[PDB]
Design a protein around this ligand. Structure first.
Ligand SMILES: CSc1cccnc1CC(=O)N1CCC[C@H](C(N)=O)C1
Ligand SMILES: [Zn+2]
Length: 139
């Protein structure tokens, strides 16, 4: 459960996208587990445009925010699941942190703003879908 509301867009995990998200689809990528749809209202989330590797993420499963050190967006292998077959997910950042399946969508942010959303996790790690390269969300 979680979305980024920037301007006239709504950024969500592709595996949790609703029927309304597909009826107003702007762009989607299975490799990135991202789906951007349109909204009528004007979102106020600031997207970070940077090369940060430290920030704070929100953990629904513990109702706590956590400071984490994270990796550069890369091509990481994600085991098979009930949404996607076993594949390499691109633009993914890993950190040491608690994660549960109901934690997808939780925001990651640095001093500059929103970095990405929780997408993968397991074995003591947590993985984030990066949104800093998507410069069109601001424009
Ligand atoms: C926060 S997700 C999590 C956390 C702890 C343990 N297992 C998970 C589950 C997970 O990693 N998923 C399931 C949903 C689809 C994901 C994907 N991008 O393909 C992979
Ligand atoms: Zn930053």
């Amino acid at each position: 459960s979680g979305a980024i509301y920037v301007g006239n867009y709504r950024v969500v995990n592709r595996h949790l996208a609703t029927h309304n998200d597909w009826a107003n689809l702007v762009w989607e990528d299975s490799s990135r587990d991202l789906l951007v749809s349109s909204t009528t209202a004007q979102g106020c989330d600031t997207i970070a445009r940077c090369d940060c590797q430290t920030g704070v993420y929100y953990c629904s499963s513990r109702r706590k925010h956590y400071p984490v050190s994270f990796s550069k967006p890369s091509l990481i292998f994600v085991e098979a699941s009930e949404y996607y077959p076993a594949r390499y997910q691109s633009h993914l950042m890993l950190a040491v942190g608690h994660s549960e399946p109901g934690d997808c969508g939780g925001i990651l942010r640095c001093q500059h703003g929103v970095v990405g959303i929780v997408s993968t996790g397991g074995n003591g790690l947590v993985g984030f879908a990066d949104v800093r390269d998507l410069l069109w969300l601001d424009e």
